[PDB]
Ligand binder design. Structure first.
Ligand code: ZN
Length: 164
């Protein structure tokens, strides 16, 4: 069911997620509830923190359709390398796009929604995306890598839309 995605001025967005002790049916309900909200909100990746569930659960799908669903439960960063930047956005940060320093390649390990351990070697957009989401699980926002002046402007610009 489409859940409410928290927007910028919200401390809940700055909460560090607590691990999934056991991926059970309830967890799998969540995973699915997320993918719906991501598709509804028309996003490419979403972290549990943005919908208030404070656990290390991340859903992604960088494919054109709804084909390649990617589930990251308890992700662990194994490697990084290189640097790149995309003018990226966030569903919790309405309409504000910005370039941010990111790794070029990244190697992770996590559990799928079945609870099985897997390993990924994302590069390119998928890398940029996994990195962006994982930050969420530690309450870290992309706008955090900006100058205080820009954070102010962003935050400020976003608020007006929220009252509208
Ligand atoms: Zn985001």
């Amino acid at each position: 069911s489409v859940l409410q995605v928290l927007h910028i001025p919200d401390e809940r967005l700055r909460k560090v997620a607590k691990p999934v002790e056991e991926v059970n049916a309830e967890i799998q309900r969540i995973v699915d509830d997320m993918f719906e909200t991501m598709y509804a909100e028309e996003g490419i990746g979403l972290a549990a923190t943005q919908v208030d569930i404070h656990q290390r659960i991340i859903v992604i799908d960088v494919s054109e359709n709804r084909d390649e669903r990617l589930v990251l439960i308890n992700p662990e960063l194994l490697e990084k390398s290189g640097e790149t930047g995309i003018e990226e956005g966030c569903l919790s940060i309405p309409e504000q796009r910005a370039l941010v320093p990111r790794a070029e390649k990244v190697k992770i390990r996590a559990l799928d929604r079945d609870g099985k351990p897997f390993e990924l070697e994302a590069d390119g957009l998928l890398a940029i995306c996994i990195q962006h989401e994982m930050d969420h699980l530690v309450g870290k926002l992309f706008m955090d890598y900006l100058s205080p002046l820009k954070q102010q402007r962003i935050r400020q610009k976003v608020e007006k839309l929220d009252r509208l």
